[PDB]
Motif scaffolding. Structure first.
Motif, PDB file in Angstrom:
ATOM      1  N   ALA A  61      18.742  24.540  -5.453  1.00 48.85           N
ATOM      2  CA  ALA A  61      19.139  23.699  -4.318  1.00 48.85           C
ATOM      3  C   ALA A  61      20.333  23.075  -4.773  1.00 48.85           C
ATOM      4  O   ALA A  61      21.252  22.715  -3.830  1.00 48.85           O
ATOM      5  CB  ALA A  61      18.260  22.525  -4.092  1.00 48.85           C
ATOM      6  N   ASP A 102       4.988  28.359  -3.625  1.00 50.04           N
ATOM      7  CA  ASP A 102       4.461  27.299  -3.331  1.00 50.04           C
ATOM      8  C   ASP A 102       3.181  27.146  -3.174  1.00 50.04           C
ATOM      9  O   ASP A 102       2.533  28.035  -2.834  1.00 50.04           O
ATOM     10  CB  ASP A 102       5.118  26.899  -1.976  1.00 50.04           C
ATOM     11  CG  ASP A 102       5.022  25.309  -1.650  1.00 50.04           C
ATOM     12  OD1 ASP A 102       4.378  24.743  -2.412  1.00 50.04           O
ATOM     13  OD2 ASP A 102       5.397  24.913  -0.741  1.00 50.04           O
ATOM     14  N   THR A 105       2.147  25.886   0.787  1.00 49.20           N
ATOM     15  CA  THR A 105       2.760  26.543   1.987  1.00 49.20           C
ATOM     16  C   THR A 105       2.846  27.846   1.795  1.00 49.20           C
ATOM     17  O   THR A 105       2.728  28.806   2.628  1.00 49.20           O
ATOM     18  CB  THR A 105       4.099  25.818   2.316  1.00 49.20           C
ATOM     19  OG1 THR A 105       4.897  26.067   1.306  1.00 49.20           O
ATOM     20  CG2 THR A 105       3.773  24.371   2.683  1.00 49.20           C
ATOM     21  N   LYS A 120       5.897  30.400  -0.520  1.00 49.93           N
ATOM     22  CA  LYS A 120       7.409  30.356  -0.295  1.00 49.93           C
ATOM     23  C   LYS A 120       7.854  31.542  -1.391  1.00 49.93           C
ATOM     24  O   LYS A 120       7.248  32.134  -1.812  1.00 49.93           O
ATOM     25  CB  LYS A 120       8.038  28.959  -0.751  1.00 49.93           C
ATOM     26  CG  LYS A 120       7.921  27.771   0.200  1.00 49.93           C
ATOM     27  CD  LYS A 120       8.217  26.613  -0.317  1.00 49.93           C
ATOM     28  CE  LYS A 120       9.952  26.594  -0.434  1.00 49.93           C
ATOM     29  NZ  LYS A 120      10.433  25.284  -1.231  1.00 49.93           N
ATOM     30  N   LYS A 139      13.789  28.427  -0.331  1.00 53.91           N
ATOM     31  CA  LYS A 139      14.343  27.359  -0.942  1.00 53.91           C
ATOM     32  C   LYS A 139      15.938  27.435  -1.028  1.00 53.91           C
ATOM     33  O   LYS A 139      16.532  26.378  -0.720  1.00 53.91           O
ATOM     34  CB  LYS A 139      13.610  26.885  -2.109  1.00 53.91           C
ATOM     35  CG  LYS A 139      14.195  25.567  -2.908  1.00 53.91           C
ATOM     36  CD  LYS A 139      13.865  24.448  -1.786  1.00 53.91           C
ATOM     37  CE  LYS A 139      14.030  23.087  -2.460  1.00 53.91           C
ATOM     38  NZ  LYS A 139      13.329  22.752  -4.000  1.00 53.91           N
ATOM     39  N   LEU A 179      17.190  27.388   2.853  1.00 54.21           N
ATOM     40  CA  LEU A 179      17.151  25.708   3.229  1.00 54.21           C
ATOM     41  C   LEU A 179      18.038  25.050   2.842  1.00 54.21           C
ATOM     42  O   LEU A 179      18.918  24.435   3.599  1.00 54.21           O
ATOM     43  CB  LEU A 179      15.686  25.274   2.768  1.00 54.21           C
ATOM     44  CG  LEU A 179      14.585  25.394   3.690  1.00 54.21           C
ATOM     45  CD1 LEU A 179      14.576  25.138   4.977  1.00 54.21           C
ATOM     46  CD2 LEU A 179      13.889  27.093   3.663  1.00 54.21           C
ATOM     47  N   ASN A 180      18.386  24.809   1.417  1.00 59.36           N
ATOM     48  CA  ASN A 180      19.488  24.160   0.908  1.00 59.36           C
ATOM     49  C   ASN A 180      20.861  25.026   1.028  1.00 59.36           C
ATOM     50  O   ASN A 180      21.608  24.703  -0.256  1.00 59.36           O
ATOM     51  CB  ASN A 180      18.905  23.809  -0.293  1.00 59.36           C
ATOM     52  CG  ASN A 180      17.643  23.069  -0.410  1.00 59.36           C
ATOM     53  OD1 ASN A 180      16.602  23.473  -1.017  1.00 59.36           O
ATOM     54  ND2 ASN A 180      17.746  21.713  -0.032  1.00 59.36           N
ATOM     55  N   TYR A 187       0.557  26.198   9.791  1.00 56.13           N
ATOM     56  CA  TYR A 187       1.750  25.716  10.720  1.00 56.13           C
ATOM     57  C   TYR A 187       2.794  26.766  10.747  1.00 56.13           C
ATOM     58  O   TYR A 187       3.703  26.861  11.619  1.00 56.13           O
ATOM     59  CB  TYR A 187       2.124  24.323  10.152  1.00 56.13           C
ATOM     60  CG  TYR A 187       3.114  23.703  10.830  1.00 56.13           C
ATOM     61  CD1 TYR A 187       2.723  23.087  12.227  1.00 56.13           C
ATOM     62  CD2 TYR A 187       4.447  23.333  10.446  1.00 56.13           C
ATOM     63  CE1 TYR A 187       3.673  22.577  12.787  1.00 56.13           C
ATOM     64  CE2 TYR A 187       5.400  22.694  11.423  1.00 56.13           C
ATOM     65  CZ  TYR A 187       4.728  22.361  12.481  1.00 56.13           C
ATOM     66  OH  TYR A 187       5.963  21.502  13.340  1.00 56.13           O
ATOM     67  N   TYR A 188       3.205  27.361   9.415  1.00 50.19           N
ATOM     68  CA  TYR A 188       4.191  28.291   9.447  1.00 50.19           C
ATOM     69  C   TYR A 188       3.397  29.641   8.778  1.00 50.19           C
ATOM     70  O   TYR A 188       2.733  29.548   7.738  1.00 50.19           O
ATOM     71  CB  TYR A 188       5.097  27.963   8.353  1.00 50.19           C
ATOM     72  CG  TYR A 188       6.143  26.854   8.783  1.00 50.19           C
ATOM     73  CD1 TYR A 188       6.300  26.416  10.114  1.00 50.19           C
ATOM     74  CD2 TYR A 188       6.876  26.064   7.855  1.00 50.19           C
ATOM     75  CE1 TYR A 188       7.012  25.574  10.350  1.00 50.19           C
ATOM     76  CE2 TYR A 188       7.548  25.273   8.165  1.00 50.19           C
ATOM     77  CZ  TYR A 188       7.706  24.945   9.577  1.00 50.19           C
ATOM     78  OH  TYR A 188       8.540  23.755   9.926  1.00 50.19           O
ATOM     79  N   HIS A 224      14.480  34.887   9.714  1.00 49.30           N
ATOM     80  CA  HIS A 224      14.159  33.796  10.700  1.00 49.30           C
ATOM     81  C   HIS A 224      15.142  32.563  10.521  1.00 49.30           C
ATOM     82  O   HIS A 224      15.724  31.978  11.364  1.00 49.30           O
ATOM     83  CB  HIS A 224      12.842  33.555  10.660  1.00 49.30           C
ATOM     84  CG  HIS A 224      12.139  34.614  11.276  1.00 49.30           C
ATOM     85  ND1 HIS A 224      10.641  34.904  11.195  1.00 49.30           N
ATOM     86  CD2 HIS A 224      12.507  35.953  11.658  1.00 49.30           C
ATOM     87  CE1 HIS A 224      10.286  35.691  11.577  1.00 49.30           C
ATOM     88  NE2 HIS A 224      11.182  36.642  12.134  1.00 49.30           N
ATOM     89  N   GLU A 251      18.653  31.113  12.290  1.00 44.41           N
ATOM     90  CA  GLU A 251      18.461  29.576  12.727  1.00 44.41           C
ATOM     91  C   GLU A 251      20.048  28.998  12.066  1.00 44.41           C
ATOM     92  O   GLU A 251      20.344  27.843  12.841  1.00 44.41           O
ATOM     93  CB  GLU A 251      17.447  28.934  12.064  1.00 44.41           C
ATOM     94  CG  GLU A 251      17.513  27.268  12.180  1.00 44.41           C
ATOM     95  CD  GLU A 251      16.110  26.795  11.303  1.00 44.41           C
ATOM     96  OE1 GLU A 251      15.642  27.337  10.743  1.00 44.41           O
ATOM     97  OE2 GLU A 251      16.176  25.401  11.647  1.00 44.41           O
ATOM     98  N   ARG A 307      22.878  29.895  11.423  1.00 42.78           N
ATOM     99  CA  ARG A 307      24.313  30.452  11.848  1.00 42.78           C
ATOM    100  C   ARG A 307      25.079  31.060  10.754  1.00 42.78           C
ATOM    101  O   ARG A 307      26.247  30.623  10.648  1.00 42.78           O
ATOM    102  CB  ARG A 307      24.904  29.371  12.668  1.00 42.78           C
ATOM    103  CG  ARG A 307      24.368  29.230  13.984  1.00 42.78           C
ATOM    104  CD  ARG A 307      24.728  27.883  14.790  1.00 42.78           C
ATOM    105  NE  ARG A 307      23.833  27.830  15.842  1.00 42.78           N
ATOM    106  CZ  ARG A 307      24.003  28.756  16.896  1.00 42.78           C
ATOM    107  NH1 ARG A 307      24.692  29.461  17.218  1.00 42.78           N
ATOM    108  NH2 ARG A 307      23.015  28.427  17.940  1.00 42.78           N
ATOM    109  N   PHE A 337       3.873  26.112  14.975  1.00 39.72           N
ATOM    110  CA  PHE A 337       5.400  25.529  15.219  1.00 39.72           C
ATOM    111  C   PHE A 337       6.029  26.632  16.222  1.00 39.72           C
ATOM    112  O   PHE A 337       6.726  26.122  16.967  1.00 39.72           O
ATOM    113  CB  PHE A 337       6.264  25.349  13.878  1.00 39.72           C
ATOM    114  CG  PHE A 337       7.488  25.076  14.319  1.00 39.72           C
ATOM    115  CD1 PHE A 337       7.775  23.578  14.568  1.00 39.72           C
ATOM    116  CD2 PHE A 337       8.673  25.610  14.407  1.00 39.72           C
ATOM    117  CE1 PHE A 337       9.028  23.262  14.861  1.00 39.72           C
ATOM    118  CE2 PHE A 337      10.000  25.278  14.338  1.00 39.72           C
ATOM    119  CZ  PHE A 337      10.066  23.792  14.897  1.00 39.72           C
ATOM    120  N   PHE A 338       5.790  27.865  15.982  1.00 37.59           N
ATOM    121  CA  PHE A 338       6.527  28.815  16.675  1.00 37.59           C
ATOM    122  C   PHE A 338       5.486  29.268  17.848  1.00 37.59           C
ATOM    123  O   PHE A 338       5.639  30.452  18.510  1.00 37.59           O
ATOM    124  CB  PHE A 338       6.637  30.050  15.760  1.00 37.59           C
ATOM    125  CG  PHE A 338       7.542  29.779  14.773  1.00 37.59           C
ATOM    126  CD1 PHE A 338       9.039  30.008  15.028  1.00 37.59           C
ATOM    127  CD2 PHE A 338       7.147  29.581  13.387  1.00 37.59           C
ATOM    128  CE1 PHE A 338       9.952  29.554  14.141  1.00 37.59           C
ATOM    129  CE2 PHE A 338       8.255  29.061  12.554  1.00 37.59           C
ATOM    130  CZ  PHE A 338       9.546  29.274  12.753  1.00 37.59           C
TER     131      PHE A 338
END
Lengths: 74, 140, 172
Positions: free
Chosen positions: C14, C42, C45, C47, C52, C55-56, C90-91, C98, C102, C104, C127-128
Protein backbone atom coordinates in the motif's frame (compact mmCIF):
# COMPACT_ATOMS: atom_id res chain seq x y z
CA UNK A 1 -41.74 18.19 17.85
CA UNK A 2 -43.56 14.98 18.70
CA UNK A 3 -40.36 13.00 18.28
CA UNK A 4 -38.33 15.22 20.57
CA UNK A 5 -40.98 15.49 23.25
CA UNK A 6 -41.15 11.71 23.10
CA UNK A 7 -37.40 11.33 23.52
CA UNK A 8 -37.58 13.46 26.65
CA UNK A 9 -40.21 11.09 28.03
CA UNK A 10 -37.18 8.79 28.12
CA UNK A 11 -35.19 10.48 30.89
CA UNK A 12 -31.52 10.15 29.80
CA UNK A 13 -31.15 6.51 28.78
CA UNK A 14 -31.08 7.02 24.98
CA UNK A 15 -30.09 3.34 24.82
CA UNK A 16 -32.15 2.72 21.68
CA UNK A 17 -31.92 6.37 20.62
CA UNK A 18 -28.23 7.16 20.05
CA UNK A 19 -29.27 7.19 16.45
CA UNK A 20 -27.20 4.68 14.51
CA UNK A 21 -23.60 5.55 13.89
CA UNK A 22 -22.32 3.54 16.77
CA UNK A 23 -19.08 5.53 17.05
CA UNK A 24 -17.88 4.65 13.56
CA UNK A 25 -14.27 5.74 13.20
CA UNK A 26 -13.83 8.07 10.23
CA UNK A 27 -10.14 8.88 10.30
CA UNK A 28 -7.67 10.24 12.78
CA UNK A 29 -7.15 13.47 14.67
CA UNK A 30 -4.56 15.96 13.42
CA UNK A 31 -2.15 14.61 16.01
CA UNK A 32 -2.51 10.82 15.67
CA UNK A 33 -5.41 9.68 17.82
CA UNK A 34 -8.61 8.05 16.61
CA UNK A 35 -11.67 10.06 15.56
CA UNK A 36 -14.65 7.98 16.67
CA UNK A 37 -17.76 10.04 15.95
CA UNK A 38 -21.47 9.36 15.79
CA UNK A 39 -22.58 9.27 12.16
CA UNK A 40 -25.93 8.57 10.56
CA UNK A 41 -25.37 6.69 7.31
CA UNK A 42 -26.77 7.63 3.93
CA UNK A 43 -26.54 5.67 0.70
CA UNK A 44 -26.46 7.54 -2.59
CA UNK A 45 -25.55 7.23 -6.25
CA UNK A 46 -24.22 9.53 -8.97
CA UNK A 47 -23.89 8.30 -12.54
CA UNK A 48 -22.25 11.38 -14.05
CA UNK A 49 -19.71 11.81 -11.27
CA UNK A 50 -17.95 8.56 -10.43
CA UNK A 51 -16.89 9.19 -6.82
CA UNK A 52 -13.13 9.02 -7.04
CA UNK A 53 -13.24 11.62 -4.27
CA UNK A 54 -10.47 11.39 -1.70
CA UNK A 55 -11.63 10.48 1.80
CA UNK A 56 -12.53 6.81 1.57
CA UNK A 57 -12.54 5.32 5.06
CA UNK A 58 -12.83 1.63 4.21
CA UNK A 59 -10.96 -0.30 1.53
CA UNK A 60 -13.26 -3.29 1.34
CA UNK A 61 -16.71 -1.82 0.58
CA UNK A 62 -19.74 -2.39 2.70
CA UNK A 63 -21.04 -2.78 6.23
CA UNK A 64 -20.71 -6.12 7.99
CA UNK A 65 -18.85 -7.78 10.87
CA UNK A 66 -15.30 -6.79 9.93
CA UNK A 67 -14.24 -3.27 8.95
CA UNK A 68 -10.80 -2.37 7.60
CA UNK A 69 -9.53 1.16 7.26
CA UNK A 70 -7.89 2.90 4.31
CA UNK A 71 -4.56 4.71 3.93
CA UNK A 72 -6.37 7.98 4.59
CA UNK A 73 -3.07 9.80 5.15
CA UNK A 74 -2.33 7.87 8.34
CA UNK B 1 -16.68 40.74 21.86
CA UNK B 2 -18.96 42.37 24.42
CA UNK B 3 -21.50 39.66 23.56
CA UNK B 4 -18.79 37.00 23.27
CA UNK B 5 -19.35 36.22 19.60
CA UNK B 6 -16.17 35.22 17.80
CA UNK B 7 -15.35 35.49 14.12
CA UNK B 8 -17.48 32.49 13.26
CA UNK B 9 -20.38 33.50 15.50
CA UNK B 10 -20.48 36.70 13.46
CA UNK B 11 -20.33 35.18 9.99
CA UNK B 12 -23.41 33.16 10.85
CA UNK B 13 -25.22 36.17 12.22
CA UNK B 14 -24.42 38.60 9.43
CA UNK B 15 -25.99 36.39 6.77
CA UNK B 16 -29.65 36.69 5.83
CA UNK B 17 -30.14 33.61 3.63
CA UNK B 18 -29.66 35.49 0.36
CA UNK B 19 -27.60 33.99 -2.43
CA UNK B 20 -24.63 36.34 -2.29
CA UNK B 21 -24.35 36.06 1.48
CA UNK B 22 -24.74 32.31 1.41
CA UNK B 23 -22.23 31.99 -1.40
CA UNK B 24 -20.01 34.32 0.56
CA UNK B 25 -20.28 33.26 4.17
CA UNK B 26 -19.78 29.56 3.52
CA UNK B 27 -16.51 30.36 1.79
CA UNK B 28 -15.03 32.60 4.46
CA UNK B 29 -16.41 30.15 6.99
CA UNK B 30 -14.40 27.50 5.16
CA UNK B 31 -11.06 29.28 5.08
CA UNK B 32 -10.81 30.47 8.67
CA UNK B 33 -11.33 26.91 9.82
CA UNK B 34 -8.62 25.72 7.45
CA UNK B 35 -6.36 28.43 8.86
CA UNK B 36 -7.31 27.76 12.47
CA UNK B 37 -6.43 24.16 11.76
CA UNK B 38 -3.09 24.96 10.14
CA UNK B 39 -2.13 27.62 12.68
CA UNK B 40 -3.33 26.28 16.01
CA UNK B 41 -4.47 22.66 15.49
CA UNK B 42 -6.26 22.27 18.82
CA UNK B 43 -8.72 25.19 18.88
CA UNK B 44 -12.21 23.78 18.32
CA UNK B 45 -13.63 27.03 17.01
CA UNK B 46 -17.00 25.45 16.25
CA UNK B 47 -17.31 24.43 19.92
CA UNK B 48 -16.79 27.82 21.58
CA UNK B 49 -19.66 29.47 23.38
CA UNK B 50 -21.13 32.95 23.37
CA UNK B 51 -22.58 34.48 26.52
CA UNK B 52 -26.04 33.19 25.60
CA UNK B 53 -24.63 29.66 25.38
CA UNK B 54 -25.13 29.13 21.67
CA UNK B 55 -22.39 27.62 19.54
CA UNK B 56 -22.14 28.90 15.94
CA UNK B 57 -24.22 26.07 14.59
CA UNK B 58 -26.67 26.66 17.41
CA UNK B 59 -26.83 30.32 16.47
CA UNK B 60 -27.27 29.40 12.83
CA UNK B 61 -30.18 27.12 13.51
CA UNK B 62 -31.59 29.45 16.14
CA UNK B 63 -31.68 32.63 14.10
CA UNK B 64 -32.59 30.47 11.11
CA UNK B 65 -29.74 30.76 8.63
CA UNK B 66 -30.52 27.94 6.22
CA UNK B 67 -27.65 28.38 3.83
CA UNK B 68 -25.13 28.40 6.60
CA UNK B 69 -26.84 25.46 8.25
CA UNK B 70 -26.47 23.48 5.06
CA UNK B 71 -22.76 24.11 4.85
CA UNK B 72 -21.94 23.44 8.49
CA UNK B 73 -23.52 20.00 8.32
CA UNK B 74 -22.80 18.69 4.83
CA UNK B 75 -19.38 20.26 4.38
CA UNK B 76 -16.54 18.25 2.91
CA UNK B 77 -12.91 19.36 3.15
CA UNK B 78 -10.85 17.34 0.69
CA UNK B 79 -7.71 19.17 1.78
CA UNK B 80 -5.38 16.95 3.85
CA UNK B 81 -4.19 18.00 7.32
CA UNK B 82 -7.63 19.58 7.87
CA UNK B 83 -9.97 16.65 7.19
CA UNK B 84 -10.97 16.20 10.84
CA UNK B 85 -13.20 19.25 10.52
CA UNK B 86 -15.35 17.74 7.80
CA UNK B 87 -18.67 16.07 8.56
CA UNK B 88 -20.02 14.58 5.33
CA UNK B 89 -17.48 11.84 5.04
CA UNK B 90 -17.66 9.13 2.42
CA UNK B 91 -17.09 5.53 3.36
CA UNK B 92 -17.26 2.71 0.77
CA UNK B 93 -17.91 3.89 -2.77
CA UNK B 94 -18.20 1.01 -5.22
CA UNK B 95 -18.20 3.04 -8.40
CA UNK B 96 -21.44 4.98 -8.88
CA UNK B 97 -22.57 4.29 -5.33
CA UNK B 98 -21.14 6.10 -2.32
CA UNK B 99 -22.21 5.81 1.31
CA UNK B 100 -21.88 8.93 3.43
CA UNK B 101 -21.57 9.54 7.19
CA UNK B 102 -23.25 12.83 8.10
CA UNK B 103 -21.85 13.59 11.54
CA UNK B 104 -24.16 14.01 14.51
CA UNK B 105 -22.05 15.44 17.35
CA UNK B 106 -24.16 18.53 18.05
CA UNK B 107 -27.46 17.76 16.31
CA UNK B 108 -28.85 14.88 18.40
CA UNK B 109 -30.70 15.18 21.69
CA UNK B 110 -27.65 14.52 23.87
CA UNK B 111 -26.06 17.95 24.00
CA UNK B 112 -27.62 21.03 25.56
CA UNK B 113 -28.16 23.20 22.49
CA UNK B 114 -28.70 20.63 19.80
CA UNK B 115 -30.02 22.21 16.62
CA UNK B 116 -32.98 19.89 16.46
CA UNK B 117 -33.88 20.89 20.00
CA UNK B 118 -33.50 24.51 18.91
CA UNK B 119 -35.17 24.42 15.51
CA UNK B 120 -38.42 22.95 16.70
CA UNK B 121 -38.91 24.56 20.11
CA UNK B 122 -37.85 28.02 19.00
CA UNK B 123 -40.18 30.93 18.36
CA UNK B 124 -42.01 31.38 15.09
CA UNK B 125 -40.05 34.64 14.81
CA UNK B 126 -37.15 32.56 13.50
CA UNK B 127 -37.65 32.51 9.72
CA UNK B 128 -37.45 29.22 7.91
CA UNK B 129 -38.06 26.86 10.81
CA UNK B 130 -39.43 24.52 8.19
CA UNK B 131 -36.86 24.70 5.41
CA UNK B 132 -34.00 24.00 7.84
CA UNK B 133 -35.43 20.56 8.55
CA UNK B 134 -35.35 19.83 4.81
CA UNK B 135 -31.56 19.78 4.80
CA UNK B 136 -30.26 16.33 3.91
CA UNK B 137 -29.34 14.66 7.23
CA UNK B 138 -31.95 16.22 9.51
CA UNK B 139 -34.77 15.24 7.18
CA UNK B 140 -33.81 11.59 6.91
CA UNK C 1 18.98 -12.17 5.38
CA UNK C 2 15.75 -10.52 6.54
CA UNK C 3 12.62 -12.58 7.03
CA UNK C 4 9.50 -11.31 5.36
CA UNK C 5 5.96 -11.64 6.71
CA UNK C 6 2.50 -10.99 5.30
CA UNK C 7 1.67 -7.97 7.45
CA UNK C 8 4.77 -6.18 6.19
CA UNK C 9 3.66 -6.91 2.63
CA UNK C 10 0.09 -5.60 2.97
CA UNK C 11 1.43 -2.42 4.54
CA UNK C 12 4.38 -1.96 2.19
CA UNK C 13 2.42 -2.77 -0.97
CA UNK C 14 0.00 0.00 0.00
CA UNK C 15 2.95 2.33 0.57
CA UNK C 16 4.12 1.53 -2.97
CA UNK C 17 7.80 1.07 -2.08
CA UNK C 18 9.21 -1.56 -4.43
CA UNK C 19 12.58 -1.19 -2.67
CA UNK C 20 10.99 -2.82 0.37
CA UNK C 21 9.53 -5.52 -1.88
CA UNK C 22 12.97 -6.44 -3.21
CA UNK C 23 14.44 -9.20 -1.01
CA UNK C 24 11.17 -11.11 -1.42
CA UNK C 25 12.19 -13.18 -4.45
CA UNK C 26 15.37 -14.42 -2.75
CA UNK C 27 13.36 -15.13 0.39
CA UNK C 28 10.40 -16.66 -1.44
CA UNK C 29 12.53 -18.97 -3.54
CA UNK C 30 14.75 -19.89 -0.59
CA UNK C 31 12.02 -20.71 1.91
CA UNK C 32 9.98 -22.80 -0.61
CA UNK C 33 7.19 -20.27 0.02
CA UNK C 34 4.59 -19.35 -2.60
CA UNK C 35 2.77 -16.05 -2.95
CA UNK C 36 -0.46 -18.08 -2.86
CA UNK C 37 -0.39 -19.60 0.62
CA UNK C 38 -2.19 -19.24 3.95
CA UNK C 39 0.61 -16.94 5.12
CA UNK C 40 0.05 -14.44 2.29
CA UNK C 41 -3.74 -14.17 2.47
CA UNK C 42 -6.33 -12.70 4.83
CA UNK C 43 -7.55 -14.98 7.68
CA UNK C 44 -11.20 -13.88 7.55
CA UNK C 45 -12.07 -12.36 4.18
CA UNK C 46 -9.49 -14.12 2.04
CA UNK C 47 -7.27 -12.01 -0.18
CA UNK C 48 -4.01 -11.65 -2.05
CA UNK C 49 -1.33 -8.99 -1.83
CA UNK C 50 -2.32 -8.25 -5.44
CA UNK C 51 -5.80 -7.25 -4.25
CA UNK C 52 -4.45 -4.95 -1.53
CA UNK C 53 -2.23 -3.46 -4.22
CA UNK C 54 -5.25 -2.89 -6.43
CA UNK C 55 -7.21 -1.29 -3.60
CA UNK C 56 -4.44 1.14 -2.64
CA UNK C 57 -4.02 2.24 -6.24
CA UNK C 58 -3.25 5.90 -5.71
CA UNK C 59 -3.06 7.98 -8.90
CA UNK C 60 -3.71 4.81 -10.89
CA UNK C 61 0.01 4.13 -10.60
CA UNK C 62 0.82 1.16 -8.42
CA UNK C 63 3.93 -0.39 -9.98
CA UNK C 64 4.46 -2.98 -7.23
CA UNK C 65 1.63 -4.84 -8.99
CA UNK C 66 3.93 -5.48 -11.95
CA UNK C 67 6.62 -6.45 -9.45
CA UNK C 68 4.88 -9.31 -7.67
CA UNK C 69 3.13 -10.57 -10.80
CA UNK C 70 6.55 -11.18 -12.32
CA UNK C 71 7.61 -12.92 -9.10
CA UNK C 72 5.12 -15.78 -9.19
CA UNK C 73 5.86 -16.13 -12.89
CA UNK C 74 9.33 -17.17 -11.70
CA UNK C 75 7.62 -19.46 -9.15
CA UNK C 76 5.77 -21.10 -12.14
CA UNK C 77 2.43 -20.42 -10.47
CA UNK C 78 0.43 -17.40 -11.68
CA UNK C 79 -3.11 -18.60 -12.28
CA UNK C 80 -4.21 -19.27 -8.72
CA UNK C 81 -3.85 -15.83 -7.16
CA UNK C 82 -4.69 -13.69 -10.17
CA UNK C 83 -8.01 -15.55 -10.03
CA UNK C 84 -8.13 -14.94 -6.29
CA UNK C 85 -11.67 -14.84 -4.94
CA UNK C 86 -12.48 -13.26 -1.61
CA UNK C 87 -13.72 -16.24 0.40
CA UNK C 88 -16.18 -14.22 2.48
CA UNK C 89 -19.98 -14.45 2.20
CA UNK C 90 -20.36 -10.71 1.78
CA UNK C 91 -17.66 -10.98 -0.88
CA UNK C 92 -17.46 -14.21 -2.88
CA UNK C 93 -15.80 -14.09 -6.28
CA UNK C 94 -14.28 -10.62 -6.43
CA UNK C 95 -11.01 -10.68 -8.37
CA UNK C 96 -8.44 -8.09 -9.34
CA UNK C 97 -10.27 -7.73 -12.64
CA UNK C 98 -13.56 -6.76 -11.02
CA UNK C 99 -11.70 -4.03 -9.13
CA UNK C 100 -9.63 -2.81 -12.05
CA UNK C 101 -12.93 -2.33 -13.87
CA UNK C 102 -14.27 -0.41 -10.88
CA UNK C 103 -11.20 1.80 -10.73
CA UNK C 104 -11.10 2.93 -14.39
CA UNK C 105 -7.66 1.59 -15.29
CA UNK C 106 -7.48 0.27 -18.84
CA UNK C 107 -3.82 -0.61 -18.27
CA UNK C 108 -4.44 -2.69 -15.17
CA UNK C 109 -7.17 -4.57 -17.04
CA UNK C 110 -4.79 -5.14 -19.95
CA UNK C 111 -1.99 -6.47 -17.76
CA UNK C 112 -4.05 -8.94 -15.72
CA UNK C 113 -5.64 -10.39 -18.85
CA UNK C 114 -2.26 -10.71 -20.55
CA UNK C 115 -0.97 -12.41 -17.42
CA UNK C 116 -3.86 -14.87 -17.74
CA UNK C 117 -6.72 -13.36 -15.76
CA UNK C 118 -10.11 -15.02 -16.08
CA UNK C 119 -12.98 -13.03 -17.58
CA UNK C 120 -15.90 -15.29 -16.62
CA UNK C 121 -15.20 -14.63 -12.95
CA UNK C 122 -18.48 -14.79 -11.06
CA UNK C 123 -18.97 -12.29 -8.21
CA UNK C 124 -21.93 -14.17 -6.76
CA UNK C 125 -22.14 -12.78 -3.24
CA UNK C 126 -24.24 -10.43 -1.13
CA UNK C 127 -22.89 -6.96 -1.86
CA UNK C 128 -23.16 -8.04 -5.48
CA UNK C 129 -26.69 -9.36 -4.86
CA UNK C 130 -30.07 -7.69 -5.43
CA UNK C 131 -30.94 -7.54 -1.71
CA UNK C 132 -33.55 -4.82 -1.21
CA UNK C 133 -32.06 -4.16 2.26
CA UNK C 134 -28.26 -4.37 2.34
CA UNK C 135 -27.46 -2.19 -0.71
CA UNK C 136 -24.90 -2.78 -3.41
CA UNK C 137 -24.31 -2.21 -7.09
CA UNK C 138 -26.05 -4.95 -9.08
CA UNK C 139 -24.40 -5.70 -12.35
CA UNK C 140 -24.44 -9.15 -13.89
CA UNK C 141 -22.00 -10.56 -11.29
CA UNK C 142 -19.68 -11.04 -14.23
CA UNK C 143 -16.93 -8.70 -15.52
CA UNK C 144 -17.97 -7.25 -18.88
CA UNK C 145 -21.38 -6.58 -17.36
CA UNK C 146 -19.53 -4.50 -14.78
CA UNK C 147 -17.73 -2.69 -17.57
CA UNK C 148 -21.05 -2.29 -19.34
CA UNK C 149 -22.84 -0.79 -16.34
CA UNK C 150 -19.85 1.49 -15.65
CA UNK C 151 -19.25 3.47 -18.87
CA UNK C 152 -15.98 1.67 -19.66
CA UNK C 153 -16.86 0.94 -23.28
CA UNK C 154 -13.16 0.66 -24.10
CA UNK C 155 -12.81 -2.10 -21.54
CA UNK C 156 -15.95 -3.73 -22.92
CA UNK C 157 -14.46 -3.88 -26.40
CA UNK C 158 -11.19 -5.25 -25.03
CA UNK C 159 -12.67 -8.07 -22.97
CA UNK C 160 -14.66 -9.13 -26.02
CA UNK C 161 -12.02 -8.73 -28.73
CA UNK C 162 -8.85 -9.66 -26.82
CA UNK C 163 -6.90 -12.69 -27.99
CA UNK C 164 -5.86 -14.25 -24.69
CA UNK C 165 -9.41 -14.93 -23.47
CA UNK C 166 -12.42 -13.59 -25.38
CA UNK C 167 -15.27 -12.77 -23.05
CA UNK C 168 -18.53 -14.69 -23.32
CA UNK C 169 -21.12 -12.12 -24.36
CA UNK C 170 -23.91 -14.49 -23.30
CA UNK C 171 -22.92 -15.23 -19.72
CA UNK C 172 -25.37 -16.13 -16.96
Amino acid sequence: ITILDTEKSFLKCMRKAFRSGKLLQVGYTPDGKDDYRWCFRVDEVNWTTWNTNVGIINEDPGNCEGVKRTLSFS
Amino acid sequence: DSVGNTVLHALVEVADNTADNTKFVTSMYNEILILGAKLHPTLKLEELINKKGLTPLALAASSGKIGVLAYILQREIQEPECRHLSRKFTEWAYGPVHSSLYDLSCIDTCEKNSVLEVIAYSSSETPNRHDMLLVEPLNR
Amino acid sequence: LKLYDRRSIFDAVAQNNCQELESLLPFLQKSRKRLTDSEFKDPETGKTCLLKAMLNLHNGQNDTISLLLDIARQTDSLKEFVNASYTDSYYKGQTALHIAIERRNMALVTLLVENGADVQAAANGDFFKKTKGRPGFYFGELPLSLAACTNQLAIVKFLLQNSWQPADISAR
